[PDB]
Ligand binder design. Structure first.
Ligand SMILES: [Ca+2]
Ligand SMILES: [Ca+2]
Ligand SMILES: [Ca+2]
Ligand SMILES: [Ca+2]
Ligand SMILES: [Ca+2]
Ligand SMILES: [Ca+2]
Ligand SMILES: [Ca+2]
Ligand SMILES: [Ca+2]
Ligand SMILES: [Cl-]
Ligand SMILES: [Cl-]
Ligand SMILES: [Cl-]
Lengths: 190, 191
């Protein structure tokens, strides 16, 4: 429909601008000009740069892809880690994710949406751990969220804290570390 | 030495207070000068920009970072580390300061280089624990100390920045236990 294709264009423009210039530069009147839509429409619908980032993160969460299902926990977590590395190492996507994390640190609306995005992604990949528990590969009571969060965590710590580039070897070690600890019962609750 | 050093101390204290209160976006060098009781021309001359002020604060934070635990056991060392990270990030002031410094790194290349240097200093210091654990035969030869130590802090930050979950002591203890278990199993042996 009309407003659906306008939203699509406005979100594309937002992702492009965030990747280019970061959250500090994101401006709704400019996104309106770039998307070719009335300034009033963009302000009315998204309100602020943080609302625009929030809705971009909503869209990203809604389109997040299903988990791998290989039959083995480590292979599943490796598929996960390698996709996160391919995403963060992409010139555009890596700059976009940095800008969206910056938005979350600057703006409470964007923070809520960023956390919801990671909740959706973790909860999807958590199905791998539920399958590993059912097949007896990891102990009963293993928290799926903790195991999955543990796979992405060192990839983001490299991105953001150490400032190192990520490699496929980093993805494999993130998955191997989490798998090893999960098998040993590290995330068995209580 | 002297008034120049006192001015830097005052300006950096003022910068930390402002970052923690109001964030990177809000930092203004003229306001910092007033808060620190220092002439504004000196503040703009010496630090230039909010990103330069953040970078120098991170330099001071790196220079002052505290020595590692040395308990005689890898997992107890990594647990001391993780508990300190959680106490820092869960502290109202310090947690806000660290979020603001990470925001500065994402927005400003000068602050980014300084941020990465800060984490390099902290990780390299705690890496001493892993080298001790190798020498005592607790983890295999060839274990990468950087990788093990980074692995401890990583899920704590991913809670802070990505999931938005509050951090607990139990989170610290699992972070240390996961990295220790993985390290003993040879996950960070280079090659
Ligand atoms: Ca612009
Ligand atoms: Ca404007
Ligand atoms: Ca703000
Ligand atoms: Ca704000
Ligand atoms: Ca699913
Ligand atoms: Ca204030
Ligand atoms: Ca020192
Ligand atoms: Ca020792
Ligand atoms: Cl993730
Ligand atoms: Cl300024
Ligand atoms: Cl750290």
């Amino acid at each position: 429909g009309r407003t659906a294709r306008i939203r699509e264009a406005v979100l594309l423009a937002a992702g492009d601008a965030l990747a280019a210039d970061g959250f500090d530069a994101l401006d709704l009147g400019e996104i309106a000009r770039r998307a070719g839509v009335g300034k009033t429409t963009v302000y009315r619908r998204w309100g602020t740069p943080g609302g625009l980032a929030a809705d971009l993160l909503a869209d990203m969460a809604e389109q997040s892809l299903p988990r791998a299902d290989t039959g083995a926990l480590e292979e599943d977590l490796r598929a996960n880690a390698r996709l996160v590395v391919r995403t963060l190492d992409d010139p555009r996507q890596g700059r976009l994710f940095r800008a969206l994390i910056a938005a979350s640190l600057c703006n409470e609306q964007a923070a809520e949406a960023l956390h919801r995005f990671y909740a959706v992604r973790v909860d999807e990949w958590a199905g791998c751990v539920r399958d590993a528990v059912a097949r007896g590969e990891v102990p009963d009571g293993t928290d799926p969220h903790g195991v999955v969060a543990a796979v992405s965590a060192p990839l983001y710590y490299a991105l953001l804290n150490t400032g190192r580039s990520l490699t496929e070897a980093d993805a494999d070690r993130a998955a191997r570390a989490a798998s090893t600890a999960a098998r040993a019962g590290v995330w068995v609750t209580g």
